[PDB]
Amino acid sequence: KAKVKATLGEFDLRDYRNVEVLKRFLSETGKILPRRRTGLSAKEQRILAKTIKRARILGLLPFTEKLVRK
Amino acid sequence: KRQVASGRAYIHASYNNTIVTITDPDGNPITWSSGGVIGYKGSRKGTPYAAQLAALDAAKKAMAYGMQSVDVIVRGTGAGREQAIRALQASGLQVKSIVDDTPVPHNGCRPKKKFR
Amino acid sequence: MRRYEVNIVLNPNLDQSQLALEKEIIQRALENYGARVEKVEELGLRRLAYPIAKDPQGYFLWYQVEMPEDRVNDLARELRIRDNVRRVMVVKSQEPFLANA
Amino acid sequence: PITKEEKQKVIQEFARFPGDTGSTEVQVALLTLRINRLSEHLKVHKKDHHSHRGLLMMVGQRRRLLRYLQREDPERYRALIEKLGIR
RNA sequence: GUGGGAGAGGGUGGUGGAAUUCCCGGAGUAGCGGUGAAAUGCGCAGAUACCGGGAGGAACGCCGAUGGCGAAGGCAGCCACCUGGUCCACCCGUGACGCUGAGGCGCGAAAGCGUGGGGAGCAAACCGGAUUAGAUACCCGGGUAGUCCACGCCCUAAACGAUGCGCGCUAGGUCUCUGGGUCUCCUGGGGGCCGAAGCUAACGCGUUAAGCGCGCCGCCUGGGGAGUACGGCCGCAAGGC
Ligand SMILES: [Mg+2]
Ligand SMILES: [Mg+2]
Ligand SMILES: [Mg+2]
Ligand SMILES: [Mg+2]
Ligand SMILES: [Mg+2]
Ligand SMILES: [Mg+2]
Ligand SMILES: [Mg+2]
Ligand SMILES: [Mg+2]
Ligand SMILES: [Mg+2]
Ligand SMILES: [Mg+2]
Ligand SMILES: [Mg+2]
Ligand SMILES: [Mg+2]
Ligand SMILES: [Mg+2]
Ligand SMILES: [Mg+2]
Ligand SMILES: [Mg+2]
Ligand SMILES: [Mg+2]
Ligand SMILES: [Mg+2]
Ligand SMILES: [Mg+2]
Ligand SMILES: [Mg+2]
Ligand SMILES: [Mg+2]
Ligand SMILES: [Mg+2]
Ligand SMILES: [Mg+2]
Ligand SMILES: [Mg+2]
Ligand SMILES: [Mg+2]
Ligand SMILES: [Mg+2]
Ligand SMILES: [Mg+2]
Ligand SMILES: [Mg+2]
Ligand SMILES: [Mg+2]
Ligand SMILES: [Mg+2]
Ligand SMILES: [Mg+2]
Ligand SMILES: [Mg+2]
Ligand SMILES: [Mg+2]
Ligand SMILES: [Mg+2]
Ligand SMILES: [Mg+2]
Ligand SMILES: [Mg+2]
């Protein structure tokens, strides 16, 4: 399986406004993805988290979702 | 005395019971059921069988209102949390979609002693 | 005077007399708190991920600024007191840390 | 807080000669500046304990560089002290 | 000094969503809850389940780690401001300015105390239901102090690495956080795991020493009696030294 950053451009980890990309590090549900699946370094992930949570308070990213099938 | 066509069907499962409410596409219920609604009383209510029959009884009771397409919402976990969706599938209701909506806090409330 | 970024998300449904009004009021705020305005991006109509003030959408603003520090908080208070402004997020500017460089 | 403008203005104020960054004088100047900042910050905020410890420390340093200075040249010490308003 | 950096380090103000409880409304019957089984309890004055709206308190899911910061206690949503500690590079400045530290002073989880707020969930005491030979307990249903905040006391702890601080010296290997570099790799600085020499009663410790040394502080001297008594000091008290 692909890790996110493996398929991706050279992109701001610090942009909370760009949803197109930030969406890719969310799960099927609103959950921020483990490093296992984001292929991100330690620092990187740590920044990514904070930029997500920002974006979330801005209504751009989902705080939580609902799971389909089941 | 509604004739509701398509509709939502929620399944709330616990370790103590299952209940199913069936409802209209804007959210108001139509009929419901539960392990205690049909025969069972004690612990017996949270068996998966009881979950089945609750599912069914509510779904036939929905036939009476004229239900056909149903969208499923599921909340909780218990035995026959699944068995209810199994019955509900082959019930004679065409299942639109299943969903798991189980509510979880972002960690706000102290739990009871049984829960930590 | 430091460099910040003001995000404003306000009620979508506005018409023109209205929208130009709240925008000029935001302006009168920034002038009044000593905020030089380096750039603006008006994104506008956008689909929110979750309903905000009963409404599925929002209208989007972004302002780069240089303003004195001890004001930024009060400036944000006054920016919020407006009814139609549903979120204000002010953020200290940062440089762009990249990835997959 | 303390920016390079302010910082420098003080170091060029207390240097023993042009170019000196680390003279005893300049260290006690800069110290004493930071000290004053912080004790103003705890004029409010009496509940900030960790900063307070920091200040006990800062103070400790200042006092040591003075103790030294006075041992070495008493005169330049009296200078430093009146100039800074201390002890 | 300069120039970079990482961080739940502290303080102050704002603010976001999830969830619980409650209240208003809709639709909707006969149960819900709960347990090994049950019963108290709640429900026809309409509950549970479902939808929409409001109010209020507390705590911050995923990220999250075997991670980070802090002198310790301890510290996790986001934002801003106020502030502490620390690390690397540059080799620029002072020129031994150092280490430790009896007393003192300050910090010090939780519970607890005082005065005034607050009160959702939880919950000592308490009230009930069970279980049992009995149940004063566990298990179930309620519930007050408390938990929360402001200010002032209290000063304990398995306050644990059960390992005082500082410095120098003594194979490596492996995982890792964070700097710098000519970036299979080197080189600082933290976190772990194996293991040289050595140590150790053993277990184990082993460049994060329990090894080889030096400095300084604390402490120990069979068990019970006993952290008791008397005395002093602190404390509103509880009680502490
Ligand atoms: Mg039951
Ligand atoms: Mg508003
Ligand atoms: Mg912090
Ligand atoms: Mg803080
Ligand atoms: Mg009602
Ligand atoms: Mg009754
Ligand atoms: Mg009754
Ligand atoms: Mg209330
Ligand atoms: Mg975790
Ligand atoms: Mg800092
Ligand atoms: Mg030199
Ligand atoms: Mg010389
Ligand atoms: Mg002492
Ligand atoms: Mg205490
Ligand atoms: Mg307490
Ligand atoms: Mg009290
Ligand atoms: Mg309770
Ligand atoms: Mg009894
Ligand atoms: Mg109880
Ligand atoms: Mg020793
Ligand atoms: Mg590197
Ligand atoms: Mg440490
Ligand atoms: Mg190391
Ligand atoms: Mg190692
Ligand atoms: Mg050996
Ligand atoms: Mg070992
Ligand atoms: Mg050593
Ligand atoms: Mg030993
Ligand atoms: Mg003793
Ligand atoms: Mg004896
Ligand atoms: Mg005692
Ligand atoms: Mg005596
Ligand atoms: Mg006494
Ligand atoms: Mg007395
Ligand atoms: Mg006692």
XYZ file of C-alpha atoms in Angstrom, chain B:
116
model
C -51.554 5.599 7.631
C -48.358 7.219 6.350
C -47.140 5.247 3.313
C -43.497 6.146 3.709
C -41.688 4.398 0.819
C -37.942 4.732 1.556
C -36.518 5.243 5.086
C -33.858 5.163 7.789
C -33.355 2.270 10.229
C -31.215 2.708 13.301
C -29.785 -0.063 15.348
C -28.666 0.711 18.817
C -26.804 -2.302 20.372
C -25.521 -2.774 23.934
C -24.425 -5.572 26.174
C -27.877 -5.447 27.731
C -30.186 -5.220 24.737
C -30.542 -4.254 21.169
C -33.190 -1.933 19.888
C -34.123 -0.945 16.394
C -36.073 2.117 15.495
C -37.241 2.690 11.970
C -37.878 6.218 10.740
C -38.562 8.653 7.861
C -35.936 10.173 5.510
C -36.106 13.490 7.514
C -35.540 11.569 10.779
C -38.820 11.000 12.630
C -39.488 7.433 13.719
C -42.252 5.187 12.483
C -42.016 1.994 14.491
C -39.523 0.375 16.752
C -38.788 -2.804 18.653
C -36.294 -4.275 21.101
C -35.582 -7.548 22.849
C -38.081 -6.721 25.552
C -40.738 -5.622 23.050
C -40.866 -9.177 21.781
C -40.787 -11.956 24.341
C -37.527 -11.707 26.290
C -36.858 -10.307 29.736
C -33.554 -10.683 31.526
C -30.065 -11.008 30.182
C -31.928 -12.963 27.492
C -32.586 -9.638 25.742
C -29.078 -9.105 24.440
C -28.700 -12.422 22.769
C -28.167 -12.113 18.993
C -31.409 -14.121 18.436
C -33.404 -11.521 20.238
C -31.503 -9.022 18.130
C -32.742 -10.859 15.074
C -36.379 -10.980 16.048
C -36.322 -7.365 17.153
C -34.936 -6.465 13.741
C -37.593 -8.489 12.032
C -40.550 -7.451 14.100
C -39.657 -3.808 13.543
C -39.230 -4.472 9.792
C -42.577 -6.287 9.294
C -44.112 -3.498 11.383
C -42.500 -1.234 8.792
C -44.041 -3.252 5.908
C -47.354 -2.337 7.447
C -46.427 1.347 6.976
C -45.306 0.478 3.463
C -41.513 0.587 3.730
C -39.282 -0.664 0.881
C -35.774 0.884 0.562
C -33.933 1.249 3.886
C -30.706 3.045 4.849
C -29.004 1.630 7.942
C -27.347 3.470 10.830
C -25.607 1.442 13.595
C -24.617 2.619 17.083
C -22.940 0.616 19.831
C -21.620 -2.889 20.277
C -23.205 -5.985 21.722
C -23.892 -9.528 20.628
C -26.021 -9.480 17.511
C -25.156 -5.921 16.833
C -24.395 -7.766 13.616
C -27.207 -10.313 13.717
C -29.623 -7.434 13.550
C -28.185 -6.261 10.312
C -28.150 -9.822 9.060
C -31.883 -10.229 9.784
C -32.586 -6.712 8.530
C -30.918 -7.646 5.223
C -32.901 -10.759 4.331
C -35.998 -9.260 5.999
C -37.512 -8.197 2.708
C -36.158 -4.758 3.001
C -33.788 -3.774 0.248
C -30.839 -2.276 2.130
C -29.614 0.983 0.652
C -26.445 1.307 2.810
C -25.032 0.310 6.155
C -23.231 2.875 8.306
C -21.433 2.801 11.686
C -22.159 6.070 13.544
C -21.248 4.954 17.096
C -20.753 8.131 19.182
C -17.433 8.571 20.877
C -16.185 11.539 22.859
C -13.019 13.453 22.170
C -12.465 12.636 25.876
C -14.705 14.750 27.977
C -16.555 12.899 30.696
C -15.534 10.790 33.666
C -16.578 7.241 33.200
C -18.216 5.053 35.789
C -15.875 2.914 37.885
C -16.798 -0.090 35.693
C -15.314 1.779 32.770
C -11.694 2.570 33.764
